[PDB]
Subunit: 177 residues, 2 copies
């Protein structure tokens, strides 16, 4: 049986929390992270999920804050634990530059749907983590130089991260200075 | 976003897909699938519609499972598994032959199985996370015993942890 509970965020409009059912036993756990039948209605008609991406990171690695005008993202953690933070980067939104954190652990499977013009970021709180995400967009893939970046610790956003000394990419450091 | 694609030397229509990965001290980033690149590995009309994860402990063996309809793209995104593909195409000259891939999350590799192929894997690490995509026409079966002597798979153990389904095929 393949079920998804779907709930809009109470605080960031258009952000959805997707909870799959999981079958569990002595062997481990099985779950379906996505079906076209159920979850393709999370994005407008004509836009399809067409990219699957994995990020394997160590403890204390912080990726973000990244977004662009075009790309819907469905994000989760399939091993370990991450603090996922979605930032509202929509200038017309009443919650512009506000954020919401989801602590996603592979034990408690949950996927977050971000529309375009939102900031995606996460911090690895486990020893190791595997972050999975699906990208839906029209046309060509939106490369890093064409995306926007906000500093992880940008004072206008004020994200509560568990550390002051994260391990950062050169991209994510550059947005800091 | 690139993929090296190679047909199996042993099982016709089985493909080994190696993505480019960016690696550094922070970790590793890779694209497991693009529609643009990997939709051409399956016939027209057949689309990848399901993404599934299986998290198993050491010594768990899942398989051998297949059906008439479903293309599967399989990999291990954490830990290490012995992935074994069995040819269960009764019209194939390599019917009941098999090929093993030791897939480690450090050495990212995806295996594409056409329909009527036996999918199975054994977890050799403490824990593993197995990822697979399913493609088929229309709406969303058979089992061989993991140790079936007609197949003769070389598994690293004689005492795997098995589901009731996978035990039943044994007797």
């Amino acid at each position: 049986a393949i079920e998804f509970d779907i709930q809009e965020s109470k605080i960031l409009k258009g952000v959805y929390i997707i909870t799959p059912n999981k079958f569990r036993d002595l062997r481990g756990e099985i779950w379906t992270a996505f079906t076209d039948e159920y979850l393709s209605k999370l994005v407008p008609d004509g836009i399809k999920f067409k990219h699957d991406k994995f990020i394997n990171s160590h403890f204390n690695v912080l990726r973000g804050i990244h977004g662009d005008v075009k790309t819907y993202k469905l994000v989760t953690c399939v091993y370990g634990e991450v603090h996922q933070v979605v930032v509202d980067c929509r200038k017309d939104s009443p919650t512009y530059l506000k954020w919401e954190k989801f602590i996603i652990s592979y034990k408690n499977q949950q996927l977050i749907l971000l529309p375009p013009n939102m900031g995606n970021s996460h911090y690895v709180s486990s020893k190791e983590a595997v972050y999975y995400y699906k990208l839906a967009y029209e046309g060509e893939y939106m490369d890093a130089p064409d995306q926007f970046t906000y500093a992880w610790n940008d004072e206008r956003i004020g994200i509560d991260w568990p550390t002051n000394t994260p391990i950062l990419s050169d991209r994510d450091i550059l947005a800091t200075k």
